[PDB]
Paper text:
The mitochondrial matrix protein cyclophilin D (CypD) regulates opening of the MPTP, owing to its potent ability to sensitize the MPTP to calcium and oxidative stress. ,,, CypD belongs to the peptidyl-prolyl cis–trans isomerase (PPIase) cyclophilin (Cyp) family that catalyzes 180° rotation about the C–N linkage of peptide bonds preceding proline and of 17 isoforms of human Cyps, CypD is the only isoform located in the mitochondria. Cyps are so named because of their binding affinity for the lipophilic cyclic peptide cyclosporin A (CsA), which inhibits their PPIase activity and so inhibits CypD-mediated MPTP opening. Here, we report that replacement of carbon with nitrogen in the pyrrolidine headgroup of a series of cyclophilin D inhibitors gives a dramatic enhancement in binding affinity (>40 fold), and prolyl isomerase inhibition (PPIase) activity (>200 fold), which is ascribed to a preorganization of the pyrazolidine amide headgroup. Protein–ligand X-ray crystal structures and NMR and molecular modeling demonstrate the importance of cis-amide geometry within the preorganized conformation, ensuring the ligand headgroup is anchored in the S1′ binding pocket, leading to potent nM PPIase inhibition and binding.
4 Compound 18d complexed to CypD with key interactions highlighted. The RHS interactions between the ligand and protein appear to be preserved from the aniline series. Structural insights from the crystal structure of 18d revealed an expanded S2 pocket that accommodates extra stabilizing interactions, specifically hydrogen bonding and hydrophobic contacts, which likely account for the observed potency enhancement. Additional analogues 18d and 18e, incorporating phenylglycine, were compared to their parent aniline and glycan-glycine counterparts (13 and 18c, respectively). These showed slightly reduced potency, indicating that the benefits of phenylglycine and glycan-fused LHS are not synergistic. However, incorporation of glycan into the phenylglycine analogue 13 to give 18d gave a 2-fold decrease in K d. The situation is different when comparing the molecules with phenylglycine; the aniline compound 13 binds more strongly, with a higher inhibitory effect, than the glycan equivalent, 18d. In this pair, although the enthalpic gain conforms to the other glycan molecules, this is negated by a decrease in ΔS for 18d (unlike an increase in ΔS on binding 13), leading to an overall decrease in ΔG and lower affinity. Notably, compounds 18d and 18f provided significantly superior protection at 300 nM compared to that of CsA, with 18f being the most effective.
Author numbering: 2 to 165
Write the structure that this text describes.
Amino acid sequence: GNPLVYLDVDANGKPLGRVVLELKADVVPKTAENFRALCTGEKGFGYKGSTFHRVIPSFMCQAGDFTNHNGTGGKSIYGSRFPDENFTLKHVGPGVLSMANAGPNTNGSQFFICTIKTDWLDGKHVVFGHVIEGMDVVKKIESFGSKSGRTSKKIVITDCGQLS
Ligand SMILES: O=C(NCc1ccc2c(c1)[C@H]1C[C@@H](N2)[C@H](O)CO1)N[C@H](C(=O)N1CCCN1c1ccccc1Br)c1ccccc1
């Protein structure tokens, strides 16, 4: 089966709700497993406590840099980086879950949730899941962003984990 995971997100201490994500282990098992483990923190590090450091309305909300907290860092459960698994899943619309990178084969822990169809990223960013529930939460996060990516409130993953 495919993992169901969750992120509980707050803005300046105040809760915004939960985002439930399906991880497509059936298509990208290595990428799904990385994200899953980072949600439970079972390796001793993960997304808990880290921020949505970059939010661009009508594009995406980006998170996952739990080492540098500014978009330069993050790491995977396999090491500092791992290859692009495949590009089978596409950026088809809002709610798509996909990996940030710094060029080919530089996946770590940073990721983003699309708020529109970002199909110009097809073949360059590995899509590995989608929002099952809580798109309204994602819209709340989005509303605190700006075209520059800076947020007007600190958007934090207070908790995360696995539902099944
Ligand atoms: O934020 C990053 N890169 C930082 C990063 C990402 C991953 C890792 C590391 C560092 C570290 C640690 C580990 N992994 C490896 O060791 C490598 O070094 N990349 C942007 C991006 O991916 N997207 C997707 C959603 C936002 N974004 C985006 C795309 C197109 C247009 C505008 C934007 Br805005 C970008 C920005 C601009 C162009 C291309 C990519």
